[PDB]
Design a protein around this nucleic acid. Structure first.
Lengths: 96, 107, 82, 92, 92, 107, 80, 95
DNA sequence: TGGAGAATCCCGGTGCCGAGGCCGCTCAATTGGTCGTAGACAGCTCTAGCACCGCTTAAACGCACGTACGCGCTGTCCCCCGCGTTTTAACCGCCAAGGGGATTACTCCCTAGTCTCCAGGCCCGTGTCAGATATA
DNA sequence: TATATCTGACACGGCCTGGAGACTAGGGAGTAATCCCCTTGGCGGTTAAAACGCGGGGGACAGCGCGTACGTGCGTTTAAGCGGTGCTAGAGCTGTCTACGACCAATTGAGCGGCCTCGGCACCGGGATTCTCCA
């Protein structure tokens, strides 16, 4: 049959998700995560929809920027694979 | 009386001088606001609005779109060095990222 | 009671977020660390948003509260009011 | 009721790009940008007035706040149109 | 007539560490620390007043500012100390 | 007029309620300042001052010195996680850094 | 002129020893000089702007403190 | 009686990490500050406290940058720090 | 080096809904005049910052030796990518309760403003103790 | 780690100005009531995406050789640094006046809510153009 080399599908996915502006995390699991986080602080709490999309946009942007710094850390270690010490190094340098 | 002339019209501006003056009074910045301060602030705000909008319209024309979308504003801000320095701490909603694949990842 | 919904942030969703950041290969230990990072960031935003809501004696967290919580920590979000 | 820069950004767009429109989300982003830059310059001018024991925000405070906040060519240009605007406002 | 927080840090230091002095540079640092924390809390209280369309800063605004800025145990103990001081002021 | 009693003595504090009230009034934060806000903020400032001075005195006795220097304040701030989170963007002059050597550099 | 060479190689070595660096390359020093030049240019430009707003010809330590506070580099013990 | 390569560096680390004194000579930093400030305004006066403030801020910034540079060096499985480590640290920090 | 399945780019028809133009009006900007006060400007002191010479001495600079270490090459095995199948939970639509955001009247307590009074913090002077130096 | 000495920063001890006491006034916010957007719980189809599994290939990782470039010690240079003097810009304080901005009131047109409309653009379908892998 037809089988692509490892990297071509990943590079096409990189080009697609860098051209697009859509939200990548599914909306309802993010809403449930937001509500279970907020229920540890105040009980019987409501949320506007725009608050949940604001949290989703901020979280997606923060994770994408963290993955950019993670990729640069992985390239700095002569690698093309991101590993958790790259994430820990990026958060240590930023100061989180 | 005389004809009511807008303060933005005699200063050659489109942004409101009176609204900026009201927001400077009610914003608890200082006890007094000078006369030239809202004119200067409206001029700077109009200049920065024009600088973002010109590059956003250029990005929309380069993508064959008549209309400015948030992706066009992100492409305007992050492709210019000065506006990216001004808005490096700011996330544009529905703006995406610039197309930037690293050189070691490409075959 | 909502419990254990951090698994709703799926492995293909983290893969898509890494593809947006320009990542060619992802190790299998990335996803738990990404879930922990997302959880820490979300508690940091949501605690301030709930504090802003509680100061107004309200029960609904608005988009203003999230915008002010992100503006506080230097992660200002446009488009949701300001 | 709700007050925003819903007509002036469109005026600047029409005098810059006369055949280009703007969407609702993009216009909300532009309104947020104008409010954020206004808050930055006004807070810097208030802080400068408090540093020099002044109870007035003049055009000089806005000028040095623009020089402090904006990067180089943007600050130089914004100083130039601000000076031109106050000169035209005083002369007319 | 440069006002400073030197004698109050003297009083607190002698209250908790009686056989312990302090240097002049340490007091410049402590004066800057008190001024910085004061400016931070008062600015957040001003923002809380402006967000909820209020013209006064009360104990609730300072409480919410202390909860926003200070980390967890620091925020809890500072809220407890402030509430104790407020009820001691009101009851006496 | 009766006997004058200070507002700091009524709240059981050493930090000045009246000075904090005056700094809130002339600092252009709000148009009005309530009665309990200077008391509350004086208490918060007194508690944070007390915590920094406790850890600084402990660090001073750890170095067998009875006077607090800036190095003792730096060791007080950065060895506590909450004060490191509060003062992470703060440089203390003549404070130095804590002695840390990574494990790969040890022989 | 040519005052960036006054920030010598042992001074950069000393600052790296304070940072816990065990081994230093020979090209660290030019990069450190450029980094210090950029940082000093930013803080000095902001302090000069603060001075010329105050109609003064003397850069006060208040101006340096406010210049560093504008960049989130708050300095304690210099009258801040 | 030559020491091993590395132990004098370790005593230097433990010496300069236990001290508060400024690691840059005062007069070259004064000349550097005046040379940089000449490009913005001609014939500026400088207080001594302003130059000491600039030196303290610059030394703290360089010490923090060298700590992050060392972290990048160990992340690259290496003891020697290189300009790519400084560039990576400033890129992650946002400069 | 050249051919085939698959993705990519380009072009024409279709429908829709969301920006965009227009009108009533109301509310906030505009004009006119008054008054107090913040700040512009001149004068003067005396603080402190620049300028310069000597010296002696710590710090820097150049050179040489060499060994730890960076870096490239090779091998391996394992772990993650690519894709087919299944299942499972997201998504959209419509749907009702019903809690709570948002607005309005009022009414009252809380806080700005003012005069007076006094006592706490502040500049200056003095002396005495806590580190740094010194040595083994 | 232990025994003597020195010195310079630091803790303590009359005036003045700002904080407290008492009163007055007015307006901001708390409380009550109500009205309706809008938030959540849920049923049901559906179809798209998450999950599981299997092969395999390419890359993380470990080991090893080597060549070189920083570490370190030592001798020589040089200019930081401390003391001391001198002098002149200018930081800062005070007095005087004047222009300028807050404030109040009457007027009016600019902008915002509401409503109707038409074309920009997403979507679907077909045709031409790479495109990437393999023999």
């Amino acid at each position: 049959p037809h089988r692509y080399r490892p990297g071509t599908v990943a590079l096409r996915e990189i080009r697609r998700y860098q051209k697009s502006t859509e939200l990548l995390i599914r909306k309802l699991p993010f809403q449930r995560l937001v509500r279970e986080i907020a229920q540890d602080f105040k009980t019987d709490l409501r949320f506007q929809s725009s608050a949940v999309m604001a949290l989703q946009e901020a979280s997606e942007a923060y994770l994408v920027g963290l993955f950019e710094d993670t990729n640069l850390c992985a390239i700095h270690a002569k690698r093309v694979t991101i590993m958790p010490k790259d994430i820990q190094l990026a958060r240590r340098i930023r100061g989180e | 009386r005389a004809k009511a002339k807008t303060r933005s019209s005699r200063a050659g501006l489109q942004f409101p001088v009176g609204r900026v003056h009201r927001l400077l009074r009610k914003g608890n910045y200082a006890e007094r606001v000078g006369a030239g301060a809202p004119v200067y602030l409206a001029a700077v705000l109009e200049y920065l609005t024009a600088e973002i909008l010109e590059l956003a319209g250029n990005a929309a024309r380069d993508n064959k779109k008549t209309r400015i979308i948030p992706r066009h504003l992100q492409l305007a801000v992050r492709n210019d060095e000065e506006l990216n320095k001004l808005l490096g701490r700011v996330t544009i909603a529905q703006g995406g990222v610039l197309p930037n694949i690293q050189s070691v990842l490409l075959p | 009671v909502l419990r254990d919904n951090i698994q709703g942030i799926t492995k293909p969703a983290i893969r898509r977020l890494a593809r947006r950041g320009g990542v060619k290969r992802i190790s299998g230990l990335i996803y738990e660390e990404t879930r922990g990072v997302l959880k820490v960031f979300l508690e940091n935003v949501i605690r301030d948003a709930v504090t802003y809501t509680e100061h107004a004696k309200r029960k609904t967290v608005t988009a203003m509260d999230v915008v002010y919580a992100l503006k506080r920590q230097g992660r200002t979000l446009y488009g949701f009011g300001g | 009721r709700k007050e925003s820069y819903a007509i002036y950004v469109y005026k600047v767009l029409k005098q810059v790009h006369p055949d280009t429109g703007i969407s609702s989300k993009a216009m909300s982003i532009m309104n947020s940008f104008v409010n954020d830059v206004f808050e930055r310059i006004a807070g810097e001018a208030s802080r400068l007035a408090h540093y020099n024991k002044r109870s007035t925000i003049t055009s000089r405070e806005i000028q040095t706040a623009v020089r402090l906040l904006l990067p180089g060519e943007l600050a130089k240009h914004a100083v130039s149109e601000g000076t031109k605007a106050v000169t035209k406002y005083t002369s007319a």
